[PDB]
Design a protein around this ligand. Structure first.
Ligand SMILES: Nc1ncnc2c1ncn2[C@@H]1O[C@H](COP(=O)(O)OP(=O)(O)OP(O)(O)=S)[C@@H](O)[C@H]1O
Ligand SMILES: Nc1ncnc2c1ncn2[C@@H]1O[C@H](COP(=O)(O)OP(=O)(O)O)[C@@H](O)[C@H]1O
Ligand SMILES: Nc1ncnc2c1ncn2[C@@H]1O[C@H](COP(=O)(O)OP(=O)(O)O)[C@@H](O)[C@H]1O
Ligand SMILES: [Mg+2]
Lengths: 728, 249
């Protein structure tokens, strides 16, 4: 249907007037990447913009910003027409003025702060119907053109004289503000937007088709995640972005109201928003109003949760609605709300990663001006547990640390301030380092699921067991073609066992990095404290959080501490078991081989373990991690100092010889002392940097075999037969 | 912006009429540490005080007491002007009288208990607009001067004959009492005041700037600690000291 029909999509780049396409559309287009284009759009309102080319788009799709996409009165997923035409020319007048409340409280000269610096060397097209936004000085400014050089197009040149009175504008009746949230105000969530985006999209954009079909569009959604994670943000974003009518319910709000006042208040919310459909209904803190465990005292609270049910279930299809609620943990809410015809969908919005945090940090760092020494790629690596709302108050508190010490000397106090200071005001790296050091980065910290940073090169030796792990994880994910042809079935779990400090934890994080699978780590002590006094109930959740993360490596680390809890050494009269070992391996038997979740245990004392976990179908492959030997003992040293400035004098072949029964962790203990003996001489020297050969000679003096000899023969005995361990 | 612009700060020393500065401001100043200075301040009300020098202040900052800082109608973090001038001279009359309820229940001779022992060998400047406080006898006494030797300055000498009827005064409509809590009535908390002090300060003193900016000033605070630790004290102190309107639940 011709290359006059294009679709809307949301840009990767942040720049104001551009559109990004691909070469197939270019081999359809045959026009430049420096050209101007005049686009046609809905409601007789159209606008002028330029194009470039790039791979991130598909064969056919169109990247835009909101500032473009709003004037065109279009939304993501609309048919647009680029109209590839070269009308190219300069314009003349281009008289602009600021917008109603967008300048409220800021005053003064706008030429050198705003406007001018935005146009320079990047002449930007303009039309009588372009509103645009300029970022700076802690503020988002909005503009409009009542007249310019006559239409359609005007293209600035590094001359053109712009003239502006200032003063507000009349607020446009229907024209949205750009300060309303949209898919660009959310970051780190990319994967769960597209999930929410598909699922809610077409029944909002295409109310008719469903009325034409017998398909039931899912209507109800539950968003998980700990507080401050952006649940309420993601909700309103979608409602704005999709065009829907967004009504909002607070839990406390309707539990604040008088008994019997809530019922009419909760009922009206649907009844009213029934009339305005298509409609979103968002319920903040569903936990407040529907808390069924031992639930509540007295009817009036037990009554309102049954009112909610008869609205969800007793929804007859009404006309058209979709309900969205939010809560901190999936639990604590009445189970009867998750049945079908009620909130059947679930979207778990976890904490962000560093790649997510940098995405967030840039969003709250946009509008403000920064010094050149800032990094923000390092910050994301120094903020560990942080949700989005922590990481926003880390930007706004760092920026108040800047404007206290800067303008206390200016000490100017009046009704409003103008932009020159703000423009010549910046935040430095010393502030971020300061606001990161307060207790504000105190933040919620719980089970994290991520792709690990460790690579294969980060571990030395072990080259064959590296080859065997990729057999057992890489391939069944890579080649589902095979394993049908030859039949059989992949084995699910693995068990590493060996001397302490020999590399088991690392080698589990390496394959996750290799297959880009998520990695969940559950350490024996942590697992056994949540059992607390005689109760846990959270184990089934780490298998859930593993299930919705697939492909996933699920790693049970230092699995020996649990068995020695029941008892170690001499031993009890009984075997080594707890009620938290049993509910693990009921749940292993639960997960299907069609799942690509993959389990790995590790133990430093194979002597003690429960045979139940070795049974075929639980942890079958047994892998014995030996101590390193000379040629590998170089690989270890060669590795962990890869970031250390070692001097040329050293012989790593020589270290590796004098050492024999050292663990890989104890080699790092030598390399550790050497480096800390270096810094003592340097610090002395303040009354030259480079690790020295003599240093390694002194460190090597105090080195310590971490594993005894007489216990090496014990690993060598279990290396042979640990299969025998079950049955007697 | 010239060495006529100084800022307010809270003194380390406890003595009544002094101001503490540093040498960089002195190499800006070039006047004595025994001199008298006449300071200018807000609301057309100003007062006379003397200076010394010390390290505890920064390069540029000014230590005061509340008894100075109130007459000037200023609060910590205001631009003040010291006006380094040597007008030095003695005065003559200096007639003082006690304040409305500040003497309630205490009576009798005030000469040998109050007043006199406070002036001795440490002649203290005085102006028609100085209210001062003397400590002793389980009580905090407050005074004022309706007239003295003509203005601006009067500087006592170890002679000058003060005369006082006694009797209350009319309670000044807006003039704060010195018995209200302030940062000097709290101790051992120095480190967590400065924390609370930064965090609440500018959005109270500068309501406008935030209305001019997109920054969100944190508004809500939780104070921990076991009972009797001074939580309620620290709260009202800040409210008084910062000027804010303090409601209590
Ligand atoms: N092959 C190896 N390559 C690099 N580092 C190693 C290796 N083996 C041990 N290490 C060091 O040991 C530390 C982590 O040891 P792990 O890989 O967890 O071995 P582990 O025996 O499972 O753990 P523990 O605590 O020593 S019982 C790392 O900081 C490494 O410096
Ligand atoms: N993914 C994200 N991207 C950008 N900002 C975020 C994100 N997650 C959280 N925030 C920040 O969190 C703050 C409030 O989050 P909120 O919507 O209240 O989450 P919740 O409702 O889950 O508590 C907002 O200021 C927003 O800036
Ligand atoms: N840091 C402090 N400095 C001076 N006085 C204190 C301090 N902490 C407590 N007090 C004394 O405690 C008394 C009452 O404390 P209060 O304000 O009731 O504390 P809270 O409200 O925490 O119980 C006051 O008389 C005050 O004299
Ligand atoms: Mg380990």
């Amino acid at each position: 249907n011709r290359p006059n029909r294009l679709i809307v999509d949301e840009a990767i780049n942040e720049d104001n007037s551009v559109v990004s396409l691909s070469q197939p559309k270019m081999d359809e287009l045959q026009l430049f990447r420096g050209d101007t284009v005049l686009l046609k759009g809905k409601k007789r309102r159209e606008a002028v913009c330029i194009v470039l080319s790039d791979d991130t788009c598909s064969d056919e799709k169109i990247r835009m910003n909101r500032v473009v996409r709003n004037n065109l009165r279009v939304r993501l997923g609309d048919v647009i027409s680029i109209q590839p035409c070269p009308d190219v020319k300069y314009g003349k007048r281009i008289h602009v003025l600021p917008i109603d409340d967008t300048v409220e409280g800021i005053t003064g000269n706008l030429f050198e702060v705003y406007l001018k610096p935005y146009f320079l060397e990047a002449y930007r097209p303009i039309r009588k119907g372009d509103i645009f936004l300029v970022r700076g000085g802690m503020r988002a400014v909005e503009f409009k053109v009542v007249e310019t050089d006559p239409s359609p197009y005007c293209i600035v040149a590094p001359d053109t004289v712009i003239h502006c009175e200032g003063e507000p504008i009349k607020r446009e009746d229907e024209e949205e503000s750009l300060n309303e949230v949209g898919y660009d105000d959310i970051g780190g969530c990319r994967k769960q937007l597209a999930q929410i985006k598909e699922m809610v999209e077409l029944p909002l954009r295409h109310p008719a088709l469903f009325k034409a079909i017998g398909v039931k569009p899912p209507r109800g959604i539950l968003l998980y995640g700990p507080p401050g994670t952006g649940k309420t943000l993601i909700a309103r974003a979608v409602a704005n972005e999709t065009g829907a009518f967004f009504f909002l319910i607070n839990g406390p709000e309707i539990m604040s109201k008088l008994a019997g006042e809530s019922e009419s208040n909760l009922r009206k919310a649907f009844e009213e928003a029934e009339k305005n459909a298509p409609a979103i209904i968002f319920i903040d803190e569903l936990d407040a109003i529907a808390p069924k465990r031992e639930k509540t005292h007295g009817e009036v609270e037990r009554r309102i949760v049954s009112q909610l049910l008869t609205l969800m279930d007793g929804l007859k299809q009404r006309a058209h609605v979709i309900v969205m609620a939010a809560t901190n943990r999936p639990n604590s809410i009445d189970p009867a709300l998750r049945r079908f015809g009620r909130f059947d969908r679930e979207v778990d919005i976890g904490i962000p990663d560093a790649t997510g945090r940098l995405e967030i940090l840039q969003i709250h760092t946009k509008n403000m001006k920064l010094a050149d020494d800032v990094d923000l790629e390092q910050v994301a690596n120094e903020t560990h547990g942080h949700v989005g709302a922590d990481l926003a108050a880390l930007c706004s508190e760092a920026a108040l640390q800047a404007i206290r010490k800067k303008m206390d000397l200016i000490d100017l106090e009046d009704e409003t301030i103008d932009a020159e200071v703000m423009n010549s005001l910046a935040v430095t790296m010393d502030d971020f380092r300061w606001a990161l050091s307060q207790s504000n980065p105190s933040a919620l910290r719980e089970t994290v699921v991520e792709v690990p940073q460790v690579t294969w090169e980060d571990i030395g030796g072990l080259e064959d067991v590296k080859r065997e792990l990729q057999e057992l994880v890489q391939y069944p994910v890579e080649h589902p073609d095979k394993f049908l042809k030859f039949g059989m079935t992949p084995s699910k779990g693995v068990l590493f066992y060996g001397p302490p400090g020999c590399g088991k934890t690392l080698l589990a994080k390496a394959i996750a990095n290799e297959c880009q699978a998520n990695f969940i780590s559950i350490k024996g002590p942590e697992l056994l404290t949540m059992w607390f006094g005689e109760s846990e109930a959270n184990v089934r959740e780490i298998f859930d959080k593993a299930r919705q993360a697939a492909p996933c490596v699920l790693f049970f680390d230092e699995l020996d501490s649990i068995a020695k809890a029941r008892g170690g050494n001499i031993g009890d009269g009984g075997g080594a078991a707890d009620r938290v070992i049993n509910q693990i391996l009921t749940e292993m038997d639960g997960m299907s081989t069609k799942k690509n979740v993959f389990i790995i245990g590790a133990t430093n004392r194979p002597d003690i373990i429960d045979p139940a976990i070795l049974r075929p179908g639980r942890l079958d492959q047994l892998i014995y991690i030996p101590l390193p030997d000379e040629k590998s003992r170089v690989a270890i040293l060669k590795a962990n100092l890869r970031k250390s400035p070692v001097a040329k004098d050293v012989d790593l072949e020589f270290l590796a010889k004098m050492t024999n029964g050292f663990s890989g962790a104890d080699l790092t203990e030598i390399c550790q002392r050497a480096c800390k003996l270096a810094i003592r001489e340097s610090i002395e020297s303040e009354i030259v940097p480079e690790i020295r050969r003599d240093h390694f000679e002194e460190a090597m003096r105090f080195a310590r075999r971490s594993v005894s000899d007489n216990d090496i023969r014990k690993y060598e005995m279990f290396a042979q037969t640990l299969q025998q361990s079950r049955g007697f």
